[PDB]
Write a protein that binds this DNA or RNA. Structure first.
Lengths: 177, 65, 75, 116, 50, 136
RNA sequence: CCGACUUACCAACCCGAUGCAAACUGCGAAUACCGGAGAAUGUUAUCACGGGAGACACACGGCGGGUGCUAACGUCCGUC
RNA sequence: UCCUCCUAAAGAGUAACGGAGGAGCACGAAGGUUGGCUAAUCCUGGUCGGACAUCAGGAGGUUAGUGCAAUGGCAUAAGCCAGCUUGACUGCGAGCGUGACGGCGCGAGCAGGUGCGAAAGCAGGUCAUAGUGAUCCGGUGGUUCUGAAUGGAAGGGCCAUC
RNA sequence: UGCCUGGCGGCCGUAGCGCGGUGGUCCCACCUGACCCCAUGCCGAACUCAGAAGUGAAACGCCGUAGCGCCGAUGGUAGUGUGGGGUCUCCCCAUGCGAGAGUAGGGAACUGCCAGGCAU
RNA sequence: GCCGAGGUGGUGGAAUUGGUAGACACGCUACCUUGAGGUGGUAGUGCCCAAUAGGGCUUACGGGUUCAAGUCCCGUCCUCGGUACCA
RNA sequence: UAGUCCGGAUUGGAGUCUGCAACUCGACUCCAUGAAGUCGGAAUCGCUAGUAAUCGUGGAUCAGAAUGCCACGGUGAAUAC
């Protein structure tokens, strides 16, 4: 909605003026945004993962997919095909509105916020931040709360470098201490 | 999207207590009244204010003449 | 502690290049597919290759993996 | 990748169709055109070919890449193949899913007189 | 070993049955298994029996 | 004594020792002790020759052993009859063909190299020679 | 709590150069085997069916091996 | 007793109280079809979460996986996932392979009746090779096939099976 | 007749990677949106539909590079069938066959059927 | 030499059905009782990281299998019981 | 009726006074913090009436430095077969 049209004017025009792009297709596009909740303590009871799924469904607009374990590990008492994590991959306009609520509303509420350090890019412009407790989104009632139950949001941009993706996310006024 | 399994996701009007109004498609079920905004936050404005980190010869002189 | 061995199960190429077969004759008994089926050759459930037509047997290398194929020319 | 993943779905059915020796009706679909070829029992030479890149088909339809153009291509390749005479043809979807446009091409080939 | 021998008996024109094996501790469920009957020459519903 | 850490099987066949050796060039060092005759060296003889050689040069220079045993050899105990299985692996040998450079040294004068290779060749069962590396 | 300073301590993975393998193989013979065509030679030397058997303790020598001690006029196989 | 590898000498086969490992099963889905997908292991980034759970990207290309030992195979996947299903069907079977034999195995096609698929097609169990015992004697079910003067029946036979 | 581009092949690395440059009138790809067909074990990412504003970025194609991968002689060597010899648990001779590795070198393919646009 | 059984805290020892072990009885340590010892009674009691919640290391050794080994498999050391005969 | 407006240890900051001097090592005040603790194992002690229990005040020592010691009052039981 808002951040899409603000992108389509200002971000493409500024990454045009300060990065040498003969074509507009070279400008990095934030493509998808996934919220992952690596619950993990549902080796004992899966009531907890069942609550965490509805917590993610309240945060985003999509019903989250439950992720079963890939290989069996006896270090953490997990079994093959045990549902141990939860995820949402949200792309398109719903991702744009989640990006609205993340920047304009959510990141002021991280409760002694000092600015997300920009060195969390992995090598090709994809960002990853970790939200430590779930109540930073105002969709949670906070009269109901049970556990802290954080998550991590990773943003996939089509940038190839860290500086191009950093300038892309900084063009949408990321905090960036 | 898969039709009925998703939660409702409606256009609401959030009421930013810094003075601002924002139409937002969300899930809260009412008109949410948030406290601080992306505007007028101390980190966003520049009022983060990390303290001096060493004012000992300042402190000695504001104590004693 | 040793001393056990199974009976040898007579695998191998039964009909070689240029041989005249009738349809239904067994050309190659094998475990995997060392040889793959080609024209007029069928692959059995234990990967036996058999003549689906009567002609002469032909061995080729084919495809991008340089694999062995068995064809039959209807003579 | 999108081009590369499709040739596997082709490669399965093409192999058994050339094993049988059947005349393969190959379809090809792009986001704005659609192609059809009637390829010989050996699989090297074609017999006929009809597409929206032909002029005389494109002179009579609005968009060259939707269902009605696919149906006109199907009836064109069916009438040309029946002027030649290829009576038993076997359709191959060439790695494309059936329902969208190659259903329309396949059906307009069938009800123009091609038995498969 | 743990598979018990059971038979599966025809419903229509029972002059015929097949015989199979079934594990009791995993599957206590019934077979119905629409197999061919040579007596009535059709595909009939068959049923689990001892 | 040299033996493989973690070999794949414990025992193996006798085999034969036909053919000529592959390691004919002296590559690592300047001088080499090369095999003239066929046979096999146990790890005990290899270490006896190595101790005699590095004692002869007074721990200067560099010594390379170029053969490793990797072949288990069994014995049957005395007053034990024929049969009842293969015998227990006792010691490891390396098979030696004619022309195999068994040892190399570099960083010594030539006469001390030759005399140390003589004093080391006295412990080995096979007939040996002194060779020098050659360019190309 | 950082973290600096080192070392005749060892060092995976990779690189460059050596070897080794019955149960390793991205290579690969000679012979042998299967089939077809031809000439010469051979007392049909070939196959099928019927009558009668004997034999089923083998030995050494060469070549390829297992075992043993690359011992045995040893033992166990393949082939002549 | 059976299976896999080596011995085994590049067709097959080939001994030893020679060298090594397994089997005496499982599964109505782990069988059939249709549609789709593609690993291991490291590196980086990220709430608890840390060598190793979940996420995202990169490298690598089958070093993975196969219900179970080893070998041969497998990308068109024989590997992984989902829809619908019972062909894990009856009578045969040209032709071969392998055994002294008893036996064991592969099989295109034909008749009947189905399942999946839009259709070409595929399916008469499973990636293949182990998971197994002859005959006699009896048990059960069906079929007038016989049935000791005759009509039944008993008892045999045949077919399925223990 | 020559360039391109697409589909089906032939062939299966002299044909694959790396590095560099180049193309958008067409063709193709990225692209745009999802009333409706259909789809997601969440998600128009994919699959699918309705399309044409931009771009050739990525992909794909073409061209140039030997840095690899790959091919690969002639000699020689190993091994070996047959017949002889020894100092015979290994070799030699007469004769027939003759590798693998390496070397000089070659090498970024070639081509058939059809369809479309271009200059002829 | 051959077969069968064992090796686990300081000790005796139960876990020998792969699902993160030492459970019980001694001994030891601390407190109480006592003028003081013993007995008795309460609480600890396999080794190192923090003062903790917890994690690392642990079944004679070494290795394999699997997601996971005290558990099944192999090799080696030590210790038991039985055999080592006919000439 | 919660580890809570109970608890008030700990620690960061700013002070005041005595004293040559408050770092080792004083007392107090303010602001902030808000630990264990939810009536206590085996055991064991004091008390017979203005007593036990509880509440405050004062003095000696002393420049400063009592939760101790010595004194003073307020309220004030239960139980003695």
């Amino acid at each position: 909605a808002k951040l899409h049209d603000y992108y389509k004017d200002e971000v493409v025009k500024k990454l045009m003026t300060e990065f040498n792009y003969n074509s507009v297709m070279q400008v990095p596009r934030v493509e998808k945004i996934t919220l992952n909740m690596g619950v993990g303590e549902a080796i004992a009871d899966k009531k907890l993962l069942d609550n965490a799924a509805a917590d993610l469904a309240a945060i985003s607009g999509q019903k989250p997919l439950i992720t079963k374990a890939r290989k069996s590990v006896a270090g953490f008492k997990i079994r093959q095909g045990y549902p141990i994590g939860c995820k949402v991959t949200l792309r398109g306009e719903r991702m744009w509105e989640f990006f609205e609520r993340l920047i304009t509303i959510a990141v002021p509420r991280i409760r002694d916020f000092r600015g997300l350090s920009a060195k969390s890019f992995d090598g090709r412009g994809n960002y990853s931040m970790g939200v430590r407790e779930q109540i930073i989104f105002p969709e949670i009632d906070y009269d109901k709360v049970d556990r802290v139950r954080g998550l991590d949001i990773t943003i996939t941009t089509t940038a190839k470098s860290d500086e191009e993706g950093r300038a892309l996310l900084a063009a949408f006024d990321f905090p960036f201490r | 999207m898969k039709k009925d399994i998703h939660p409702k996701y409606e256009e609401i009007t959030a009421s930013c207590s810094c003075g601002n109004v924002m139409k937002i498609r969300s899930t809260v079920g009412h008109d949410l009244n948030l406290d601080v905004c992306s505007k007028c936050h101390p980190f966003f404005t520049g009022k983060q204010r990390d303290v001096a980190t060493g004012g000992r010869v300042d402190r000695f002189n504001k104590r004693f003449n | 502690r040793n001393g056990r061995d199974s009976e040898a199960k007579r695998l191998g190429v039964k009909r070689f290049g240029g041989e005249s077969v009738l349809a239904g004759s067994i050309i190659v008994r094998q475990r995997g597919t060392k040889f793959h089926a080609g024209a007029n050759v069928g692959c059995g459930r234990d990967h036996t290759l058999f003549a689906k037509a009567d002609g002469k047997v032909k061995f080729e290398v084919k495809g991008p993996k340089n694999r062995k194929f068995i064809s039959i020319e209807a003579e | 990748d999108k081009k590369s993943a499709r040739i596997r779905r082709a490669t399965r059915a093409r192999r058994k169709l050339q094993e049988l020796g059947a005349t393969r009706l190959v379809v090809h679909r792009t986001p704005r055109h659609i192609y059809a070829q009637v390829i010989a029992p050996n699989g090297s030479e074609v017999l006929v070919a009809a597409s929206t890149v032909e002029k005389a088909i494109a002179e009579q339809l609005k968009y060259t890449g939707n269902k009605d153009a696919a149906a006109a291509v199907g009836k064109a390749v069916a009438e040309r193949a029946l002027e030649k005479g290829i009576k038993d043809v076997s359709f191959d979807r060439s790695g494309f899913q059936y329902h969208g446009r190659v259903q329309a091409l396949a059906d307009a080939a069938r009800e123009a007189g091609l038995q498969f | 070993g743990i598979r018990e021998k059971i038979k599966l008996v025809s419903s229509a024109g029972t002059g015929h049955f097949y015989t199979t094996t079934k594990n009791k501790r995993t599957k206590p469920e019934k077979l119905e298994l629409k197999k061919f009957d040579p007596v009535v020459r059709q595909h009939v519903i068959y049923k689990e029996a001892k | 004594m040299l033996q493989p850490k973690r070999t794949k099987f414990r025992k193996m066949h006798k085999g034969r020792n036909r053919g000529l050796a592959q390691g004919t060039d002296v590559s690592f060092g300047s001088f080499g002790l090369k095999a003239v005759g066929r046979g096999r060296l146990t790890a005990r003889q290899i270490e006896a020759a190595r101790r005699a050689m590095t004692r002869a040069v007074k721990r200067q220079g560099k010594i390379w052993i170029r053969v490793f045993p990797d072949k288990p050899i069994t014995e049957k105990p005395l007053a034990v009859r024929m049969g009842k299985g293969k015998g227990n692996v006792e010691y490891w040998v390396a098979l030696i063909q004619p022309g195999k450079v068994l040892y190399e040294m570099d960083g010594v004068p030539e006469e001390l190299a030759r005399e140390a290779f003589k004093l080391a060749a006295a412990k080995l069962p096979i007939k040996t020679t002194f060779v020098t590396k050659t360019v190309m």
